């Protein structure tokens, strides 16, 4: 029945109100990224053997990330 009555908790309220969460977001460029302190350490064979190009990765590496749902984004 409404836009606000579809992505919020209540749905049987057909009055079109706007909660404070509904705010305009513009595509901005002021954003910093963090260079990780550890990478995957992928080692190429560097021989280029006549039976293919080898790529190897053995050491595992994990990291945790928050998930903002209303933005549907992982950080």
């Amino acid at each position: 029945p409404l836009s606000a009555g579809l992505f919020k908790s209540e749905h049987k309220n057909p009055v079109p109100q706007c909660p404070p969460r509904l705010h305009v977001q513009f595509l901005s460029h002021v954003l910093w990224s963090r260079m990780p302190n550890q990478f995957l350490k992928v080692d190429v064979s560097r021989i280029s053997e006549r039976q293919g190009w080898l790529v190897q990765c053995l050491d595992p590496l994990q990291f945790m990330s928050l998930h903002i749902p209303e933005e549907n984004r992982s950080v």
Binding site: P1, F7, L22, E70
Partner: protein, 565 residues
């Protein structure tokens, strides 16, 4: 056995490339033809391979995908933006009316090109025979000019015409200024004595390039000969032969008398007291700035252009603040610069390869009398195709000009008392969405409240296109999958009804006019309705619903797409 699906009808804009992604615990082998590998199965008809897709006379290696995703120490060559390879048609000559004053010269030089077309074949040992062969060392187009028909003289005629027209198009003006064969006597004069000027040599090179471009555009209709590349991308061994053929035309003519990337450290590493010194190495001499900023610096504005940074640029030898002042000297390829800041005296200094920089007033000090604020963090900025290197200390064995300057005046490295490296934040490229701040110029968003609306406003002199978007996205269940755009009349729009399980975020892309009061209104008729109420000058503003999409440009179409089968 092939799979039963493919991503048809997708955007072909861009340079495609094969890629493989893996997490950990994997051993993968690419398989091509030739010395790189061996195919296990047979390719379908037509489909070539990458070892043949490689450009002729170029090496082939494997980068990761984009950047320096290498497990390395501080000796990582951090790079700024790049160019589109500078290459990702011949010159127009026929659009020039040929002056008849030198049509006699266009025929004379044609006769000369014809007699040399005889000359080379006879040097190889070709006679004059009635059969058009190449292995029988004979040629029927070696007889005198007048006896040659229209089926044999047009070649040399056009050869002369195109060179003269290419000359006029290039810009210089054209005007007034023995081995016994089997019947023909080609001997115009001694045209290989006077030295040909370098301008005419480059001109003959350009003529050969144009002829090769025409011949290659003819050749692309054929398979995949390595000569289908332009003349600039041609092997240098055969380059001189094509120039030699075109040199004779000008020889006869003369003889006859006729987006920068910013990098910094973590804001928590800011300093408020003491002497801090760090090195910045640059293997190039392009656009590169280095200095100390405050923990409020913009990752998109010019480094130092505001009250949030104090920098120095060697590409122009200028200290950078609100304005630019000529300071110090420029650097070259493969240099270092040590930056020192004393917070007890508010003194900034820069030493290019141990040489302290001097200003115009004869003072080694660069900046003075600045507020401490909240701290100063090192910062660098690289331009197009500029790579560099930063050193915050912790390796005094690798620091070069620390003992030359810094070790004696109580100056310390920035990360000397550290057990782990610095996080080394940077400016990201993908422009994600952010909420409109109240202290933002030229874009104001208000809120009112009958019905509830969210009006806009702006005061500026330069116009652009925005990408306004709502915060909360509407999610679609497994069964629901449809979207209808109804104008002031009825529902007439593109059939956008495909979403098994997705989250669409409402958005409108509005152009900024002098007065822009277009806004969004959550309304109701029978279901969820959002009305992006437009106003005057509404011909390029769009309004739709979009998932996560990060692209900043000015285009109504050319959007990414793919239909899976």
């Amino acid at each position: 056995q092939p799979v039963q699906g493919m991503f048809e009808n997708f955007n072909i804009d861009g340079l495609f490339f094969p890629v493989v992604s893996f997490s950990a615990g994997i051993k993968v082998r690419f398989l091509l033809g030739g010395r790189h590998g061996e195919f296990k199965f047979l390719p379908p008809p037509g489909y070539a391979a990458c070892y043949e897709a490689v450009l002729p006379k170029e090496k082939l290696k494997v980068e990761h995908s984009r950047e320096y995703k290498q497990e390395r120490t501080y000796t990582r060559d951090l790079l700024g933006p790049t160019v589109s390879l500078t290459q990702a048609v011949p010159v127009d000559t026929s659009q020039i009316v040929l002056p008849p004053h030198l049509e006699r010269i266009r025929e004379r030089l044609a006769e000369n090109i014809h007699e040399l077309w005889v000359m080379n074949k006879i040097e190889l040992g070709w006679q004059y025979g009635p059969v058009r062969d190449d292995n029988k060392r004979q040629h029927p187009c070696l007889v005198e000019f007048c006896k040659l028909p229209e089926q044999e003289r047009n070649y040399n005629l056009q050869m002369s015409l195109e060179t003269l027209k290419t000359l006029l198009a290039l810009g210089c003006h054209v005007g007034i200024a023995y081995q016994l064969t089997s019947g023909y006597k080609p001997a115009p004069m001694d045209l290989s004595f006077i030295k040909l000027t370098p301008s005419q040599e480059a001109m003959v090179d350009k003529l050969a390039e144009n002829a090769h471009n025409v011949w290659a555009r003819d050749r692309i209709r054929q398979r995949r000969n390595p000569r289908l590349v332009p003349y600039t991308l041609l092997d240098d061994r055969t380059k001189k032969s094509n120039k030699d053929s075109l040199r004779e035309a000008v020889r006869t003519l003369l003889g006859y008398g006729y987006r920068f990337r910013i990098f910094r450290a973590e804001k928590t590493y800011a300093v408020k007291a003491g002497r801090w010194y760090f090195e910045f190495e640059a293997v190039t001499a392009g656009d590169m700035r280095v200095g100390w900023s405050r923990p409020g610096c913009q990752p998109d504005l010019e480094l130092g252009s505001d009250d949030r940074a104090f920098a120095f640029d060697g590409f122009k030898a200028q200290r950078w603040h609100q304005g630019n002042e000529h300071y110090g000297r420029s650097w070259q390829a493969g240099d270092v610069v040590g930056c020192m800041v004393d917070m007890n005296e508010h003194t900034m200094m820069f030493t290019l390869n141990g040489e302290i920089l001097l200003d115009d007033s004869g003072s080694e000090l660069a900046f003075k009398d600045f507020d401490v604020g909240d701290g100063f963090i090192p910062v660098c900025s690289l331009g197009v195709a500029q790579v560099g290197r930063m050193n915050f200390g912790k390796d005094v064995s690798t620091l070069k000009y620390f003992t030359i300057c810094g070790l004696q005046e109580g100056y310390e490295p920035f990360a000397v008392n550290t057990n782990r490296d610095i996080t080394m934040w940077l400016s990201k490229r993908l422009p994600q969405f952010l909420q409109v701040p109240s202290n933002h110029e030229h874009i104001e968003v208000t809120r009112i409240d009958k019905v509830t609306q969210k009006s806009f406003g702006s005061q500026n002199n330069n116009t652009d296109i925005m990408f306004y978007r709502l915060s909360m996205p509407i999610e679609c269940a497994x069964x629901x999958x449809x979207x209808x755009x109804x104008x002031x009349x009825x529902x007439x729009x593109x059939x956008x009804x495909x979403x098994x399980x997705x989250x669409x975020x409402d958005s409108d892309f509005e152009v900024l006019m002098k007065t822009a009061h277009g806004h969004l209104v959550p309304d109701r008729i029978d279901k969820d309705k959002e009305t992006p109420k437009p106003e005057f000058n509404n011909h390029k503003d769009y309004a739709q619903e979009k998932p996560s999409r990060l692209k900043q440009x000015x285009x109504x179409x050319x959007x990414x797409x793919x239909x899976x089968x």
